Amino acid sequence: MNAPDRFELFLLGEGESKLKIDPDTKAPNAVVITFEKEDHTLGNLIRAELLNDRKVLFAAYKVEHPFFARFKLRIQTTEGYDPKDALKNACNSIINKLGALKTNFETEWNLQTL
Amino acid sequence: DESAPITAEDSWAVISAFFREKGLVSQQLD
Amino acid sequence: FIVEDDESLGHKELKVRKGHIAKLMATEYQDEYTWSSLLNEGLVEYIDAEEEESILIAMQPEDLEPAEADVDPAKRIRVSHHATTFTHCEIHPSMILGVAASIIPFPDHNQSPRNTYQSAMGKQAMGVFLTNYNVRMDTMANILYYPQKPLGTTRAMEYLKFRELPAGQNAIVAIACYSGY
Amino acid sequence: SNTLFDDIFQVSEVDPGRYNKVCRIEAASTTQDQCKLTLDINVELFPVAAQDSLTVTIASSLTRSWRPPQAGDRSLADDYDYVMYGTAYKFEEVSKDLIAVYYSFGGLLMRLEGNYRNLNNLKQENAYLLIRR
Amino acid sequence: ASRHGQKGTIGITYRREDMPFTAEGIVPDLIINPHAIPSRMTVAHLIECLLSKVAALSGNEGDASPFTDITVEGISKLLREHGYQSRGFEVMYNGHTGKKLMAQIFFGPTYYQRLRHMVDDKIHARARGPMQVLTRQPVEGRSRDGG
Amino acid sequence: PSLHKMSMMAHRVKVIPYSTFRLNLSVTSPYNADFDGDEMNLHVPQSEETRAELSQLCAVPLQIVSPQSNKPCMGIVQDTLCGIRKLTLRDTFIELDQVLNMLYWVPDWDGVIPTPAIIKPKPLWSGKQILSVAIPNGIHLQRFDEGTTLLSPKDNGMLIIDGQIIFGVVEKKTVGSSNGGLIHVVTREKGPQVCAKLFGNIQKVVNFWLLHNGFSTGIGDTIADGPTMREITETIAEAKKKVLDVTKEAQANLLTAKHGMTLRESFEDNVVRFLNEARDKAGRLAEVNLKDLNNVKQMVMAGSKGSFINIAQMSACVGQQSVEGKRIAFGFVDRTLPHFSKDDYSPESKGFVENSYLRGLTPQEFFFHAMGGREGLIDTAVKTAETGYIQR
Amino acid sequence: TLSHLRRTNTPIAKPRQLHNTHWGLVCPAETPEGQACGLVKNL
Amino acid sequence: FDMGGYFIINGSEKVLIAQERSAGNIVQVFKKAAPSPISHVAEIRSALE
Amino acid sequence: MIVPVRCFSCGKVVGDKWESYLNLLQEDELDEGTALSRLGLKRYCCRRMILTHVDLIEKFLRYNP
Amino acid sequence: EEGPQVKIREASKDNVDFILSNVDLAMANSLRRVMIAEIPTLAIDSVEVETNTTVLADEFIAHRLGLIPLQSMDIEQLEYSRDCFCEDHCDKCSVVLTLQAFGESESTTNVYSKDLVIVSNLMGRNIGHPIIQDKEGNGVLICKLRKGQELKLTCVAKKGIAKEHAKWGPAAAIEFEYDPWNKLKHTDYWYEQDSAKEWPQSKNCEYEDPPNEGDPFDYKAQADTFYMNVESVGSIPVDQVVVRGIDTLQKKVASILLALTQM
Amino acid sequence: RGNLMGKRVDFSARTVISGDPNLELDQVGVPKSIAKTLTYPEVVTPYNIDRLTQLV
DNA sequence: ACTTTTTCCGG
RNA sequence: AGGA
DNA sequence: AAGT
Ligand SMILES: [Mg+2]
Ligand SMILES: [Zn+2]
Ligand SMILES: [Zn+2]
């Protein structure tokens, strides 16, 4: 009755952009990206991969409140390296990893006789 | 041995037969 | 239950024997020997609070009847078969309880009022109140979609028909601290 | 920009009183008899047992945020097996020339009793703790 | 509420992915607070659970009857026979990260009842509305759009 | 009811979905609300004037340190309290990954990653270290508990210098609604809004850390080890004989009454004293036999919920059941139940509950506990009504 | 429904307390809280 | 399942609630209060069957 | 009141398994423990779904219109 | 062969047991999440009821119908109704099922998921067939009727994910485990006397090496190798619950990369 | 007592309460339905006029 | 001889 | 008649 | 349960 619509979890609202990149005032070379209509599935996954980037000094994500599916992702990189890029590179890596994961599953699946 | 003393679980066989005849609202009715 | 000193073969023993229990269950299997049949064979009697004053009651028959001529540590600490004066035996102590309390699982392992609280809450629960709900025009009625009988049950529930007309559902529960909600 | 204390001690006792990963250690300096040492250690990480020769260095350097890798390239002022970082909180005058300094490594406490490290030990947040062997 | 005078309202509803799961893929229907049990001393609640856990795995009705020989130690023997840790604890994993919880959770079935009090039947607001005839003051009751 | 100036406080509206009035957990206590179906009122000011009155006089942060007892009337409760202990033990260390999230989770973070307590082998931060980020600079707090050396051996008391924890486990005494408390210091020293922020700030780092660490409580936490149960049984056994000894001594006229007391009054006082001494002895035995890994003990330790008496009754023994002080009276002629022989003054006949809740109660013990329980509920009901008029 | 057909009202020296005599005849737990506590007995 | 033991009046189901009272023709002795001219009383609430 | 389709906790299709369960009991003379497991219900959430089901529908059908 | 490795242990119509090695836990968990609530399926989402003379209520049956699993194989070639241009539904975006039942029999007449008939055009794609895993080929039991009890209704099944409703759940329970000998110290075993005795050993203990106490704690150690088991409800076949999950997640990450390029 | 010292009032709302660890100390979660019913009277001023018309 | 209070909130 |  |  005061319950929102289920699809509001994944469907982007009236003029809501998936990514809202805003710079962080407190820290140099830092940025805070708000991911609209997104949950832990993406947050923890991105944050973890950003942690595998040597040129990434700081990376964290938070789901500020649960009623609302959106997470803030903070990124701080070594001077010269742009954080927008750090996220780009990290995103690719994931897709490239999952790419081999799909390939490797299919090869092993086909091998089965059940 | 049809006159062997009764066990612990045996009391339930009497309780069962109680409600069977009496019923849970007997008091209101009777 | 009546207990009589009267027993040629030994001590003071309960008028009701294993042969009677089987004779009752012959009639229980049909669905001759009724409750009235135990009453008139004088194996059981009706005692008011006045007559209660003049009698002596055994809780358990078996534990409180024959005497000692090791012990389990997990069980609750019980007294003794000391008395040789026993005029009556208690059918089952769980019969001290009324309708609502008889749905409480292990109420003996609970704090005294927590049981009084439950014997007020179960009167606010949902579920099938009667099978004729669809043919009756009541001012308000709530029926649970998918009632489940309990996994933890009282032998007394058999008589309250709780397994046939439940109040809840067996939820898969975890006592944990999560998001702090 | 320099070391503040250096000596080698021998472990008297090891104390895991209710703590599974932490132990309070008792030691005495091989050099000066004047010097004693009580210290809490992550024994899950670097473990210690009774009668161990352990080097103990203090040092003010090698301010602001903290950087994790790239350090392969950086000059790691650790030749020591276990390193810590904490704050000074008490300067105890235990009579004579004898002094005792209290260090807190985020809860992990340390009490160093000696005499000579006068112009060295300061009531500083900037105090590392390096341990080898 | 449970059959142990333990009343409670929903605080949030989480989907299967946000929920903390057993390695066996099991997830709770309900999450109750550790803090409920000690002050209350409703031990029967935990016994209901341990017994009901076996009952579900055994497929035999669990006796929760008051005056009997059913020991908490007895029930624990049967649960270890079913491969779970005797006292019903299970190592759960955090639904958000996947990473194991440092704690083991008391996890098993417990008969919960739904009660006649539901928020949307209770909720009420007013901001100028019907007034009394005599006192010329706001009328009484949610139904009547009272103050 | 509203027997407090703090039972009516001004708040900032936050429009949210779902039909419930949501409220911060630390404000639970002043209102006295639980979430068991409790309801609450909301009144809306119509003037820019009546608004000022709410915002400037009765806002929740103003209402923190109460004149009722010159101490903070709101603290850290439940989950946050429990987790805050677990977090601050010397044994508790957090890896980079999580530390970074806990730092971002504090909304008023400086954006500075603190230097870890252990910089290699592997950088590890301590609970204290990262909770100290929630604690503002300029905050000074010292407290000594039993045997608190400046080199705290048991991690007793508290030592916070410049808004950084030096030693001690944070629990009910520090972070709670206590006179010397971290809250009282903050409210006074830093401001009411600075402290109001701190509440959230602490609960964010904590609830998050606890969300990921997990915390439970099961039947396993009421089980007292086998040898301690022998010790408890024989603890009750000797106090039962001590009672019998005074019972035969009184039937033999040898018992000499206490000045200004019946011979019987003198006897009952002694019986009731031995049985209650044993209830504690059996109790105290268990509370010692439970390791720091007992969840009930863990709650009691932080002081989040539960006390010794609750451990005692669940694990060891329930104890003497009383009605109007005097143990279960002879309602029947010279007996408590028809399952007793007349003139039975023994622990069992007069209502001493030898058993623990874990082991279960006997039908006699149950019915006696029941009489005892009933008296308390009638009192609750009578007291509630009396106490109200007194307030009026 | 059952518990309502087994209710007992006591009108108007200490009746609210659970008496020893109530053993077997009345429920020691089934009773309301408040003004009716102990004066509303269940069989 | 419906047990009966109730009535149907003007549509609704009505329960007659058992009304507890003290037994009649019973001899009872009570110590009448500290400030009283009467120390003890023997009362008999006697009414025809 | 009629077998729930899919177990509340995990989601395993359970509405089919009913008559088969009622048959592994009556006709096959098995116990509830072995019956549930023949039907391949291993997690207790699935087990409880069938084990604790009260098929009230059958009583409602006994009424005429 | 490449990056993260897979080694399938057991396979069937309903279950895939495998081991995911050289992977991040965050990756194996984000994968767990996706398989539960982000793969699209197809299930009844609109039930126009014509006649209901049953013991159950219109909406009771309604809710039931959505839970019936429908073939969601070639689901990828069905549009999400929202994205389609027709007012309401069409063949491009929906499957239309009809259900008629009546108690002709003097005995109780049962209403099964088999009793559903597809009235819409399937465009020659694999969709909307009620999943019948049943031995007697009956499928889900929707209802029961006596005599004159008729059940007439039309149903529109649509795309949707489990995030919107658990009816679009492609997977049942997902078994996930790592480090059967707690060598990571990711858990603190509660006990009475012995941690190792009181806690039962995992079956996965066999596939990993025992700790061997005479060795210090490997702090350097990270969690890789995830002993998993995915269960299909019936809609999509097991393998595809995996593959489709892997893909779905890639697609989510790609959408970010793409939306990043728009800015 | 009932009509003068105490009074039934307007601009008042009541519902079930639930705890939220993500709310601030001083804030109260208000359900949309209730916010949508409860109404503050704001005076049209040059500062608000623009916002105010948008809400109108 | 004679009066008055007792916590707060669907029909 | 019922909730806190 | 008190107090004109
Ligand atoms: Mg409450
Ligand atoms: Zn299941
Ligand atoms: Zn279309």
Side-chain angles (χ1 to χ4, degrees), chain J residues 79-94:
Chain J
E79 214 156 30
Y80 273 90
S81 274
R82 56 167 150 281
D83 300 328
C84 188
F85 291 90
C86 59
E87 88 226 76
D88 206 18
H89 57 75
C90 68
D91 292 330
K92 300 167 162 197
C93 69
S94 71

Coordinates of all heavy atoms in Angstrom, one line a residue, chain J residues 79-94, ligand 3:
Chain J
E79 N 10.1 -10.4 -26.6 CA 10.3 -9.1 -26.1 C 9.7 -8.9 -24.7 O 8.8 -9.7 -24.3 CB 9.9 -8.0 -27.1 CG 10.7 -6.8 -27.1 CD 10.7 -5.9 -28.3 OE1 9.7 -5.8 -29.0 OE2 11.8 -5.2 -28.5
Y80 N 10.3 -8.0 -23.9 CA 9.7 -7.7 -22.6 C 8.6 -6.9 -23.0 O 8.7 -6.0 -23.8 CB 10.7 -6.9 -21.8 CG 11.7 -7.7 -21.0 CD1 13.0 -8.0 -21.5 CD2 11.5 -8.0 -19.6 CE1 13.9 -8.6 -20.8 CE2 12.5 -8.7 -18.9 CZ 13.7 -9.0 -19.5 OH 14.7 -9.6 -18.7
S81 N 7.4 -7.2 -22.4 CA 6.2 -6.5 -22.8 C 6.3 -5.0 -22.8 O 5.8 -4.3 -23.7 CB 5.0 -6.9 -21.9 OG 4.4 -8.0 -22.5
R82 N 7.0 -4.4 -21.8 CA 7.3 -3.0 -21.7 C 8.0 -2.4 -22.9 O 7.7 -1.3 -23.3 CB 8.2 -2.7 -20.4 CG 9.6 -3.4 -20.4 CD 10.6 -2.9 -19.4 NE 11.5 -3.9 -18.8 CZ 11.1 -4.8 -17.9 NH1 9.9 -4.8 -17.4 NH2 12.0 -5.7 -17.4
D83 N 8.8 -3.1 -23.6 CA 9.6 -2.8 -24.7 C 8.9 -2.9 -26.0 O 9.3 -2.4 -27.1 CB 11.0 -3.5 -24.7 CG 11.8 -3.3 -23.4 OD1 11.7 -2.1 -22.9 OD2 12.5 -4.2 -22.9
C84 N 7.9 -3.8 -26.0 CA 7.1 -4.0 -27.2 C 6.1 -2.8 -27.4 O 5.9 -2.1 -26.5 CB 6.3 -5.3 -27.0 SG 5.4 -5.8 -28.5
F85 N 5.7 -2.6 -28.7 CA 4.9 -1.5 -29.0 C 3.4 -1.6 -29.0 O 2.7 -0.6 -29.2 CB 5.4 -0.9 -30.4 CG 6.7 -0.3 -30.3 CD1 7.9 -1.0 -30.5 CD2 6.9 1.1 -30.0 CE1 9.1 -0.5 -30.5 CE2 8.1 1.7 -30.0 CZ 9.2 0.9 -30.3
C86 N 2.9 -2.8 -28.8 CA 1.4 -3.0 -28.8 C 0.8 -2.5 -27.5 O 1.4 -2.7 -26.4 CB 1.2 -4.5 -28.9 SG 1.9 -5.5 -27.6
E87 N -0.4 -2.0 -27.5 CA -1.0 -1.7 -26.2 C -1.2 -3.2 -25.6 O -1.7 -4.1 -26.3 CB -2.4 -1.0 -26.3 CG -3.6 -1.8 -26.5 CD -4.6 -1.4 -27.6 OE1 -4.2 -1.6 -28.8 OE2 -5.7 -0.9 -27.3
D88 N -0.8 -3.4 -24.4 CA -0.9 -4.7 -23.7 C 0.1 -5.8 -24.3 O 1.3 -5.7 -24.2 CB -2.3 -5.2 -23.4 CG -2.3 -6.2 -22.2 OD1 -1.3 -6.2 -21.4 OD2 -3.3 -6.9 -22.0
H89 N -0.5 -6.8 -24.9 CA 0.3 -7.9 -25.4 C 0.1 -8.4 -26.8 O -0.9 -8.0 -27.4 CB 0.2 -9.1 -24.4 CG -1.2 -9.6 -24.2 ND1 -1.8 -10.3 -25.2 CD2 -2.0 -9.4 -23.2 CE1 -3.0 -10.5 -24.8 NE2 -3.2 -10.0 -23.6
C90 N 1.0 -9.1 -27.3 CA 1.0 -9.7 -28.6 C 1.8 -11.0 -28.6 O 2.3 -11.4 -27.6 CB 1.6 -8.7 -29.6 SG 3.4 -8.4 -29.4
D91 N 2.0 -11.5 -29.8 CA 2.8 -12.8 -30.0 C 4.3 -12.6 -29.8 O 5.0 -13.5 -29.4 CB 2.4 -13.4 -31.3 CG 1.0 -14.0 -31.4 OD1 0.4 -14.4 -30.4 OD2 0.5 -14.1 -32.6
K92 N 4.8 -11.3 -30.1 CA 6.2 -10.9 -30.0 C 6.7 -10.9 -28.6 O 7.9 -11.1 -28.4 CB 6.4 -9.5 -30.6 CG 6.0 -9.3 -32.1 CD 6.0 -7.8 -32.4 CE 6.0 -7.6 -33.9 NZ 6.3 -6.2 -34.3
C93 N 5.8 -10.5 -27.7 CA 6.1 -10.3 -26.3 C 5.4 -11.3 -25.2 O 5.9 -11.3 -24.1 CB 5.9 -8.8 -25.9 SG 4.1 -8.3 -25.9
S94 N 4.4 -12.0 -25.7 CA 3.7 -12.9 -24.7 C 3.2 -14.3 -25.3 O 2.9 -14.4 -26.5 CB 2.5 -12.2 -24.2 OG 1.5 -12.0 -25.2
Ligands
ZN3 ZN 3.6 -6.9 -27.6

